Amino acid sequence: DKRIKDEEDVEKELGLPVLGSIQKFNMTNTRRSTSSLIVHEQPKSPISEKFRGIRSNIMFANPDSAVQSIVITSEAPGAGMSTIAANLAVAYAQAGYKTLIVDGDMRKPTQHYIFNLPNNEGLSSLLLNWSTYQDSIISTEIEDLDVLTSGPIPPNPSELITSRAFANLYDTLLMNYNFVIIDTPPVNTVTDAQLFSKFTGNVVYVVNSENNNKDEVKKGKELIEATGAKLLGVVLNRMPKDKSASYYAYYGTD
Amino acid sequence: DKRIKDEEDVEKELGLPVLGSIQKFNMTNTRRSTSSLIVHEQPKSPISEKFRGIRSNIMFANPDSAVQSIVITSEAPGAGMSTIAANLAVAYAQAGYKTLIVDGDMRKPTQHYIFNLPNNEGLSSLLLNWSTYQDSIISTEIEDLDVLTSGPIPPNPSELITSRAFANLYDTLLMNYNFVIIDTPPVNTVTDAQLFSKFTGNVVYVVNSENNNKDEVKKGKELIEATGAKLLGVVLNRMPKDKSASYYAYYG
Amino acid sequence: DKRIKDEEDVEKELGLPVLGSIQKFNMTNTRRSTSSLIVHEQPKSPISEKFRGIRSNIMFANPDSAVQSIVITSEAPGAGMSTIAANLAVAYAQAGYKTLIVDGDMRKPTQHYIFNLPNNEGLSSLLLNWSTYQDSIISTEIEDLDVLTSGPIPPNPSELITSRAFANLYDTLLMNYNFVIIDTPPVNTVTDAQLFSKFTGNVVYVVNSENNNKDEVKKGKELIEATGAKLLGVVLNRMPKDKSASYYAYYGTD
Amino acid sequence: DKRIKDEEDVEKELGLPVLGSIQKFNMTNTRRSTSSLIVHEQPKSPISEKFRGIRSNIMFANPDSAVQSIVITSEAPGAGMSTIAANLAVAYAQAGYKTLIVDGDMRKPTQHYIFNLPNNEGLSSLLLNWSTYQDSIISTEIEDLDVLTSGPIPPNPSELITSRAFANLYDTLLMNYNFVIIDTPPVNTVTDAQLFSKFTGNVVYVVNSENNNKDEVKKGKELIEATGAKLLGVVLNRMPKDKSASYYAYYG
Amino acid sequence: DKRIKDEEDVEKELGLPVLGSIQKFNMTNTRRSTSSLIVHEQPKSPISEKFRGIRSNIMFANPDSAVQSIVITSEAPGAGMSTIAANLAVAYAQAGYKTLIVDGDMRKPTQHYIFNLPNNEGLSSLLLNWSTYQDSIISTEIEDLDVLTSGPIPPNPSELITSRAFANLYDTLLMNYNFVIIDTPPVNTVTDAQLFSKFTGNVVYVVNSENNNKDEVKKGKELIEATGAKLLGVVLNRMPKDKSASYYAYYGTD
Amino acid sequence: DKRIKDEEDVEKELGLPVLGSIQKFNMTNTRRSTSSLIVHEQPKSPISEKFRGIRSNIMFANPDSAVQSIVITSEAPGAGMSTIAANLAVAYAQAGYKTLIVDGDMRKPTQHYIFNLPNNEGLSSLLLNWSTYQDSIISTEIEDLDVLTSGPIPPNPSELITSRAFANLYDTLLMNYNFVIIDTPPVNTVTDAQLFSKFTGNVVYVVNSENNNKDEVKKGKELIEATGAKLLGVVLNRMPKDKSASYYAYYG
Amino acid sequence: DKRIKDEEDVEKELGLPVLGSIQKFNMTNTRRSTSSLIVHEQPKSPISEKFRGIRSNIMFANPDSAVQSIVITSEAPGAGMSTIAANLAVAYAQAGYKTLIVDGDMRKPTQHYIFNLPNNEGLSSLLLNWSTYQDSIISTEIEDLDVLTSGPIPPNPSELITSRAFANLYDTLLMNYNFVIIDTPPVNTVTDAQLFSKFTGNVVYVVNSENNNKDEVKKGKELIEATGAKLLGVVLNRMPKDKSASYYAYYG
Amino acid sequence: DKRIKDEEDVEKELGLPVLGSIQKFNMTNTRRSTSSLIVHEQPKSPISEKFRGIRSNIMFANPDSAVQSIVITSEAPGAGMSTIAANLAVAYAQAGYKTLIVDGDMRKPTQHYIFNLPNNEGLSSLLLNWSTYQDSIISTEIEDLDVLTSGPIPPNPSELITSRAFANLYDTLLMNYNFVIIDTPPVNTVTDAQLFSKFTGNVVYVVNSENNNKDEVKKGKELIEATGAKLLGVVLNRMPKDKSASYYAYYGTD
Ligand SMILES: [Mg+2]
Ligand SMILES: [Mg+2]
Ligand SMILES: [Mg+2]
Ligand SMILES: [Mg+2]
Ligand SMILES: [Mg+2]
Ligand SMILES: [Mg+2]
Ligand SMILES: [Mg+2]
Ligand SMILES: [Mg+2]
């Protein structure tokens, strides 16, 4: 079966740059992590080093003006969006950006597990004014990283996104944070990630290398680009362990 | 075998963007909805989610200035025109647009059946000046959706459309709704859809993937463009149930 | 034998749009009419619906300015010109245009049979000042439709057309009518339809689908275009009963 | 077999519009006319109708400004030059143009035979100043058609054409007629036609489909263009009687 | 052998127009002439009619300004130059141009035989001031035609041509004559015809159809064009009697 | 067999100029040098001469304005980065430029081994503000060459590079040296090299002809260009000893 | 078989106009001339006539402004340089130009043999300032032709050419002659011809059709163009005696 | 084996003009010289005549401004650089240029043998200020020719070249000399000839026809051109004795 796969495939099928490749987490490239927050728990690891790669290429993909927010999305469920988003967030934090990860998936949120946080209040309650700005965002044990978790599952998630309420939040967010990452649901599945892109204008696209359909990843791209926002590039996730390239190797007196 | 079957066939045969695909209804993808007004019955079903997609990229398809009104048409009857019109209207309303749906099908209307409303007074009688504006538009149970039903079957539907009464009514509607969707008869069959199209300059074209003749389809396309209107794009209907297909996952 | 035929043929041979197709009148698409004035006598019929198609596409073929007059013509005798012209006239009437059909065929006039009217006075007597403006035009039992029949057969029909007399009439006609249809003789046969086109500038071309020669229809086109007037498109007439397309079908609770 | 046979062959061999086709006379298409001046004898015959066509699209072939004068010529004798000249003149007159036909064939004139007029005085004697203008042009039975006959065969026809007397006469004619048609000798044979052409800048070129050599034909074409004149187009003559062919129906 | 031949050959090899074709003088196309001055002695003949053809096409080859002088020349001896030149001169005369034929062949002059005149004084003696302007030009029995014959054979003919003396004569000639024809020697053989062209700027080129070499006729052309003067076209001479074309036929009640 | 082997393979695979080739060291081409700092040990050896070449045409590769600082990097470890950095620094100093070499490899530094210097204080501790500028840069035995060693292995090398302390330090360095060369870790492995590159806008890219994968090589190329930096060109390393090859004659 | 044989071969091999062809002398085409100065001995011979051709179209080859001076050269010795130079000079004089011919061949001069003049004083001694201008140029029997002979063979011919004395002399010559032709040594062999060419900017290039190597010939061509000079064109020499060939008729 | 060879090869491989070809010195084309200073010792010889060829083509390769200095260089040792340079220098002298040959090869200098001169002081000592301007340049027995020999072998030759000291010398040199030839070491071997080119801007390139590698001569060219200086052309040296061409022949009464 014909999927994408590796950096050449991306080039050929999507005509976009690969910002970085993660490597399906084994015990070598993560220095055995328990949680999937590799950048926090094993910061000198090759996979962590790839995240830093992505961080950089994001700032590089756009000179003249610093990019202060992204949507992370993909064509389909379980591609790694949530995982990419969190590690990337941590990377941003480590470099002294005041960093907000936002859980804009108000349908199957995972940020609150990843960072292991209560989800009584969050984006949804925030936008409905069920909860307050100070109470809804939490500061984590990771310096310079806050999380705005999804909040209760609303009945009308996409409509919450297209509201002055969100427009207003988003404006408030870019005043108070140097970098904003919005985790979203898959773009083929619900329109959510489109509407988030309309605000950010920059999208990072996660393609699950182990499992995808060439044409859907194609329609995801076209759905993002339809909003007019810039697709900064791709992160290939769940890449096979090579790891003869180096690229994947560990570098530092061991 | 001459059918436009999928979004490739649209690209290739008509050169148009596909705004969304609606699959053939089933209990799963409608999430057990009991009518065809699925965006209202089962707001969180995949079929509904796809209507939000259409909603979304209708809006993107014309950046700088909003799209205020569309026509919904198709090359033939039974393609889903009325059903897509009604659902799309519900989706818009949920997005918080003051929406009107107009049954511009004064020959075989169905909006009164969709929204289970009376149809004594409506578009025709409004136009013939035999009923008032406020008497003719009804507010539904659905927040922010009004319906201007077709009214009685007039003897001259299309001549009513190009009358000065509809032009006045149309300006009036644009003062009073953020979004106006006009259901129509098929465009190959009678002009009506064309006339409406001239007023909206914006058309969503429904193609019933399950049963269509590709030549008749591009013919509806040329009949629309002739009006000067913009074809925002195609909606595919009755698509075959790929559901394999992360386009149609229940999430979650 | 190689004739035109159907919409594709028109496209290929003439490089012009088809404004509409009539269907050879049977009992189904006309709801049995006696007279050939289908738009008057069976207004909710598919053939009548096609005429309305044509009406529309005529107004569409020319934005910036409304088209207030046409010549209807064809390559050859018995193509349907006269029949198209009358039904179209009626369609225009039904839509509240004040509509004059003019019988500019002063050699084999048929309008006076179609509408069943006396032909003692008409265009020819009008132009010669044998008859008066008020007496020469008749109002029919069809609201908003008048007919100016041909008048007596003159000896010099084409010369009557190229006269200040006609220029003057034509000017008077566009003051008093919202829409003017001029029926003419075949353009391959006599120059008449050219000279009428020089005034109107818009020509509707009737091709008899059952019976024509590809090349003559071609020379008709070139003869019209030689006058500088716009050929708005084609009406294919006498089309075979398909009627699996729909396009030809009846639409409305029966 | 090297003949230019039909309007395709014109297009292809000469790149010119065909202003009309005249078929080989017969009782039907002349409607039993008793002379060759058919536009006058049998005004309503198909052959005549075709002359009205030529008339018409002579006029269209040069929009913005009228065409006031033409030359009629051909590559060879017996092609129909004189006959088309005379009929075309009648057609113009019926259209109500004050027309003059000039027999510029001072070698083998035939306009005096066509219009059965005397030929004592005429173009030559006018030019040599041996007869007056008013004495030389005659008014025919036909309303609005004058004929300036060739006059006696002079010893130097072409040198008369480029004389200052013809230039003066020519300006004079243009003051006095809405339309002036000059019949000429064939253009391959002697210059005369060329000289006239320089004065009219407008030429109708007759090609006798029944008998012609295609190379000699394009050669007449280059001989004309050399003058700077416009070739308004071709008239085909002696065409073979398609009559099947709604071009040549009697209507009616 | 490959020579030129007919009008098509000229087109192909020289890319120039044919101004006219003479026909090798027989008894039919000349109405039996004794002398080779056909235009004078049999003026209504087909060959004479061809000369008139040439006359016309010369005036036609150059609008904006009338062409008041030509050089007649060719690639090679006995092509007909002298014969063309004289008849053409006569044609010009007959049309009321005051016409000077000049015998610029001061090496094998023939004009004085053609017109049968004394050659004691002429161009050569004129330029050397051996003879006077009034005595050196003769008026012939042909109205409006004068001849300036060659004069005695000088030792330095080409140098006489490139002199202020000639420049001066030439200027005087264009004041007193409406048309000037200069007969010259063959352009491949001596430079004479080049230098005459530098004054006239218009050259008529005579190709002997019976006898020539394709490539030399080519070099003649290039030699003329090198002076910058306009080659108005070609006269094909000594053409075969066809005379089925007509073109060659006689036209006028016989 | 997928290696970039020679300057043809550079041209073809990467489209870049080759600034110089360094062959695999031997007693002849190093002229019996006892360390790898050959430009200093054996200033007149061919290998050294080739470093002067690189020096030279670094400078030509950017005419109008001098190149003040470069990054040295490569797609993989063991390619010669550190060695070319150090020698190139010596060459520059001999040319009389006040040169600084910065060990920007805060993971596996080797500049302290090359120049046999202590590495207690250096880039890291400077950046963390735990040691002073004058304490951190050392002046070597070599006239006009200072070395800013890596300092202790910090826990966060790349985050130190994009800190405001390095930006300040970097401006400071440019005030104080005519030429600054930054050794780095391989560019495929960790970002560091990219970050430095953004500051210099000038990169010399080392390709180890003896052992490399051509795809990984162009990948380092794209990783560099992404920064906006100029790739001045390639240095080939460990080239195979053509010495036949007047490129590598001992002259004399 | 690698020879440039005819004017086709010139066109094709060198892209140049042929100003004239000189055939191999014989009693007929020289008309029994007793020396090689044929334009003077036998002014009316075909060979002479052809020199008038060259004369003529030298002048045409540069319209707007006269050509005042040329160099005559060739790729090899024995090609006819001196002979064409001398005759061309005579032709010019007969045309009434105050002509000077300069023997710029101070190695193997022959102008003194052609014009049978003494050669004690001349170009060299003039340049070295060992003889005066008026002493060095001689007036020949031939009206309007002076000859500046080569003078004694100097030890440094080319260094004399680029001296400031020749520049002064050259300006002086241009004040004093309407036309100056410089004979030279072959251009492949020694620079002299090049130097002269820089002063005239005008070159006539002689190619000896009877014996030449086509590569050496285009090489003389590039050697000339290098100077910036105009190559007015080729003279072909020793052509084979077509005489069949109206180019070479005796007329008459 | 594939080397260059002859003038066509240069054209094909280098896309540059050949300024001249020397001929491997035998007893014929040198009139037997002992020393390799042919232009001095056998000035009327064919090889000497070729040098004069080069001289000229150098002045020709660059109009608008006279070229007052060159670097002579080549791809590789023993190509003839030094020999070309000296003879060329002499040629320049003979034409009354005040001519300095500079020995910029401070690694294997040969100028001092060629001209047979002491090498205690020269360029190297000059630049280090070990020696004076007046003492370091010597006037030879050849009128108008001075030599600045290399001086002692310095430890850092290339650095001496890139110094204000050299910049200053070079400036002083172009004030006092009409023409400056700098002999250099091979450009593939040491960077020296590049740095000399940066000052002169014009380079003459010597290719040893008997012995070279096509590709290295190619890299030499690219190395010169990298400095931005003009490569004026090539001198092919050590060319085979043909000498049927002529080009190589002797011209002058023998
Ligand atoms: Mg997710
Ligand atoms: Mg419906
Ligand atoms: Mg009719
Ligand atoms: Mg006639
Ligand atoms: Mg002659
Ligand atoms: Mg390293
Ligand atoms: Mg000589
Ligand atoms: Mg050397």
Author numbering:
A (entry chain B), C (entry chain B), E (entry chain B), H (entry chain B): 197 to 222, 1001 to 1228
B (entry chain A), D (entry chain A), F (entry chain A), G (entry chain A): 197 to 222, 1001 to 1226
Question: Can you quote the paper on this entry?
Answer:
The structure of the inactive P-loop CapAB(K55M) mutant was determined to 2.6Å resolution. It presents a subunit fold highly similar to that of the CapAB wild-type protein with an rmsd of 0.67 Å over 241 aligned residues. The major difference concerns the quaternary structure of this unphosphorylated form of the protein that associates to a ring-shaped octamer. The total surface contact area of about 2,000 Å between two neighbouring subunits is characteristic of biological interactions. Residues 216b–228b of the tyrosine cluster that were disordered in the phosphorylated wild-type structure form a long loop with Y225b side chain fitting in the active site of the neighbouring CapB molecule. The side chain of Y225b is bound in the active site of the neighbour subunit via hydrophobic sandwich interactions with the side chain of K82b and the two consecutive proline residues P159b–P160b forming an extended hhhhDTPP Walker B motif characteristic of the BY-kinase subfamily of P-loop ATPases. The hydroxyl group of Y225b is pointing toward the 4.8 Å distant β-phosphate of the bound ADP molecule. The catalytic residue D79b from the conserved DxD motif is positioned to deprotonate the Y225b hydroxyl, a prerequisite for its phosphorylation. Despite the absence of a nucleotide in the crystallization solution, ADP-Mg is observed in the P-loop of the CapAB(K55M) mutant protein. This is in agreement with a previous study showing that in P-loop proteins, this mutation inhibits the phosphate transfer but increases the affinity of the protein for the nucleotide.
We describe here the first crystal structure of a bacterial tyrosine kinase, namely CapB from the pathogen Staphylococcus aureus, in complex with the cytoplasmic domain of the transmembrane stimulatory protein CapA. CapA and CapB, among others, are involved as copolymerases in the synthesis of extracellular polysaccharides that are thought to be potent virulence factors. Reproducing the Gram-negative organization of BY-kinases by direct linkage of the Cap5A1Ct fragment (herein called CapACt) to the N-terminal extremity of Cap5B2 (herein called CapB) allowed the production of a fully active soluble protein called CapAB. The CapB kinase core possesses a P-loop type α/β mononucleotide binding fold.
